[PDB]
Amino acid sequence: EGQSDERALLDQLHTLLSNTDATGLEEIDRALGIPELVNQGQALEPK
Amino acid sequence: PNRSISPSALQDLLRTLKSPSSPQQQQQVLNILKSNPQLMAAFIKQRTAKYVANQPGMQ
């Protein structure tokens, strides 16, 4: 796209959605295997 | 939701977590999450990043 308003609204939205945590976000994370993706090192990958 | 892919979720995924994940505990996050694929990947990335910054084990 032209990542301008798309960038700025993506940035604030991923900031909300990862602001530390949220009490049902634990399920949303395990529903996406994220606590396993941690030990896989996915946080450290450029993709 | 075409130029920017999330400009609707800018209201609804935003209010889906601005209204806390207690009454918002369900997959209603996950159902709006999927709409902007870069937001979904940025969520998964920064979710994983927040975790390795808390509980890395070996990563």
From Swiss-Prot, chain A:
Tissue/organ expression: Widely expressed. High expression in heart, skeletal muscle, pancreas and placenta. Low expression in brain, and very low in lung, liver and kidney.
Motif (LXXLL motif 3): 13-17
PTMs per UniProt: Acetylated by CREBBP. Acetylation occurs in the RID domain, and disrupts the interaction with nuclear receptors and regulates its function. Methylated by CARM1.
Domain of life: Eukaryota
Subcellular localization: Cytoplasm; Nucleus
Renumbered residue ranges of the record's region Interaction with CREBBP: 1-47
Entry's family note: Belongs to the SRC/p160 nuclear receptor coactivator family.
Other notes: NCOA3 is frequently amplified or overexpressed in breast and ovarian cancers.
Subunit structure: Present in a complex containing NCOA2, IKKA, IKKB, IKBKG and the histone acetyltransferase protein CREBBP. Found in a complex containing NCOA3, AR and MAK. Interacts with ATAD2; the interaction is enhanced by estradiol. Interacts with CARM1. Interacts with CASP8AP2. Interacts with CSNK1D. Interacts with DDX5. Interacts with ESR. Interacts with ESRRB; mediates the interaction between ESRRB and RNA polymerase II complexes and allows NCOA3 corecruitment to ESRRB, KLF4, NANOG, and SOX2 enhancer regions to trigger ESRRB-dependent gene activation involved in self-renewal and pluripotency.
Function: Nuclear receptor coactivator that directly binds nuclear receptors and stimulates the transcriptional activities in a hormone-dependent fashion. Plays a central role in creating a multisubunit coactivator complex, which probably acts via remodeling of chromatin. Involved in the coactivation of different nuclear receptors, such as for steroids (GR and ER), retinoids (RARs and RXRs), thyroid hormone (TRs), vitamin D3 (VDR) and prostanoids (PPARs). Displays histone acetyltransferase activity. Also involved in the coactivation of the NF-kappa-B pathway via its interaction with the NFKB1 subunit.
Free-text domain note: Contains three Leu-Xaa-Xaa-Leu-Leu (LXXLL) motifs. Motifs 1 and 2 are essential for the association with nuclear receptors, and constitute the RID domain (Receptor-interacting domain).
Protein name as it appears in the record: Nuclear receptor coactivator 3
Species per Swiss-Prot/TrEMBL record: Homo sapiens
Lineage: Eukaryota, Metazoa, Chordata, Craniata, Vertebrata
Portion of the full sequence shown: 1045 to 1091 of 1424
Curated annotation (Swiss-Prot), chain B:
Modified residues (Phosphoserine): S6, S19, S22
PTM characteristics: Methylation of the KIX domain by CARM1 blocks association with CREB. This results in the blockade of CREB signaling, and in activation of apoptotic response. Sumoylation negatively regulates transcriptional activity via the recruitment of DAAX.
Location within or outside the cell: Cytoplasm; Nucleus
Source domain of life: Eukaryota
Assembly and oligomerization: Part of a complex composed of MSX3, CREBBP/CBP AND EP300/p300; the interaction with MSX3 decreases histone acetylation activity. Interacts with DHX9 (via N-terminus); this interaction mediates association with RNA polymerase II holoenzyme and stimulates CREB-dependent transcriptional activation. Interacts (via transactivation domain and C-terminus) with PCNA; the interaction occurs on chromatin in UV-irradiated damaged cells. Found in a complex containing NCOA2; NCOA3; IKKA; IKKB and IKBKG. Probably part of a complex with HIF1A and EP300. The TAZ-type 1 domain interacts with HIF1A.
Record's function text: Acetylates histones, giving a specific tag for transcriptional activation. Mediates acetylation of histone H3 at 'Lys-18' and 'Lys-27' (H3K18ac and H3K27ac, respectively). Also acetylates non-histone proteins, like DDX21, FBL, IRF2, MAFG, NCOA3, POLR1E/PAF53 and FOXO1. Binds specifically to phosphorylated CREB and enhances its transcriptional activity toward cAMP-responsive genes. Acts as a coactivator of ALX1. Acts as a circadian transcriptional coactivator which enhances the activity of the circadian transcriptional activators: NPAS2-BMAL1 and CLOCK-BMAL1 heterodimers.
Protein name (database record): Histone lysine acetyltransferase CREBBP
Organism: Mus musculus (Mouse)
